[PDB]
């Protein structure tokens, strides 16, 4: 009978864990949609048809949506306990009839200022005009480390005669870890996210030395400024990392409450 009471309490606690996970993911569904709309706005702003005045029109809308992301992260609560603000940390849900049979749960901080919601950015210090084409030096290497802790060597052999904008497209196609773009002055920029790149990115090679690169500026969603074409081109990559962080976190919660789906049934038999 003590076991029967224990399982009765266990299924109640597990159902509470499902409710907490469901509430966190429910607010998370809108968090994804705001980022997708922000990526929509960033895509439109990067167009050259938008004048200076229009780029501000996106910027106020994106800033409002960024404020909305902070609102959802902070205000989302379950019984007065904030879930997506990062103050919840890790809680162990007791789903057993005896002490020490709990299972942990973690929800990362879903603020727009979270480190996982962005990455680092490297800017070419030399602008290339519309008439610049790659010469006899094309090799460009990027040496960094993945989140798994192993060194990754990524080599691009750019094709001669391609202007800077074609070069940005080619670097994007060749490798998925980094993302290339071009700003107002024609300065190639690389974005190394915070989930697939840890540590500084060592850019080298004949093309890398000629183009030149500076220190990595750490950026997040809250730093998105679509008032400039470089900011909007960069913003597309930032929210790609943000959506990746959100989606990878959602699949962690879905597998978590799926685990309760099997657990609650198991404790029933």
């Amino acid at each position: 009978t003590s076991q029967s009471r224990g399982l009765d309490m266990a299924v109640k606690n597990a159902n509470d864990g499902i409710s907490i996970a469901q509430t966190a993911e429910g607010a998370m569904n809108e968090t994804t949609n705001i980022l997708q709309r922000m990526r929509d706005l960033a895509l439109q702003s990067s167009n050259g048809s938008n004048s200076s005045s229009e780029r501000r029109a996106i910027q106020e809308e994106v800033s409002a949506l960024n404020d909305e992301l902070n609102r959802i992260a902070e205000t989302t609560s379950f019984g007065g306990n904030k879930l997506l603000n990062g103050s919840f940390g890790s809680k162990s849900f007791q789903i057993g009839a005896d002490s020490g049979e709990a299972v942990m749960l973690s929800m990362g901080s879903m603020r727009s200022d979270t480190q996982a919601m962005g990455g680092k950015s490297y800017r070419a210090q030399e602008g290339k005009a519309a008439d610049w084409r790659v010469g006899a030096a094309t090799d460009l290497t990027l040496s960094y480390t993945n989140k798994q802790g192993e060194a990754r060597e990524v080599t691009i052999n750019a094709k001669q005669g391609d202007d800077l904008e074609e070069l940005a497209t080619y670097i994007n196609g060749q490798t998925e870890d980094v993302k290339a773009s071009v700003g107002e002055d024609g300065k190639l920029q690389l974005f190394a996210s915070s989930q697939k790149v840890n540590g500084d990115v060592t850019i080298g090679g004949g093309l890398g030395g000629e183009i030149g690169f500076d220190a990595g500026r750490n950026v997040t969603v809250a730093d998105v400024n679509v008032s400039t074409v470089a900011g909007s081109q960069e913003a597309v990559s930032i929210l790609d990392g943000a959506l990746k962080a959100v989606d990878s976190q959602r699949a962690s919660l879905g597998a978590f409450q799926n685990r309760f789906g099997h657990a609650i049934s198991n404790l029933d038999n």
Binding site: D16, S19, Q22, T23, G26, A27
Partner: protein, 53 residues
């Protein structure tokens, strides 16, 4: 958020009719069982009276 919050208070506060009716049927059968056993239990002193008196 409102819907999942409503689902949560359902999971704890809202009663389950399937279990409650089964439990309160066990309650009713106990009532008939207890009334019957009580009627049969008080005949023991009556048997004692008929033994001597």
């Amino acid at each position: 958020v409102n819907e999942n919050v409503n689902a949560s208070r359902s999971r704890i506060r809202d009663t389950d009719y399937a279990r409650e009716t089964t439990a309160m049927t066990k309650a009713q059968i106990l009532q008939q069982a207890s009334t019957s056993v009580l009627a049969q239990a008080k005949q023991s002193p009556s048997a004692a009276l008929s033994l001597l008196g």
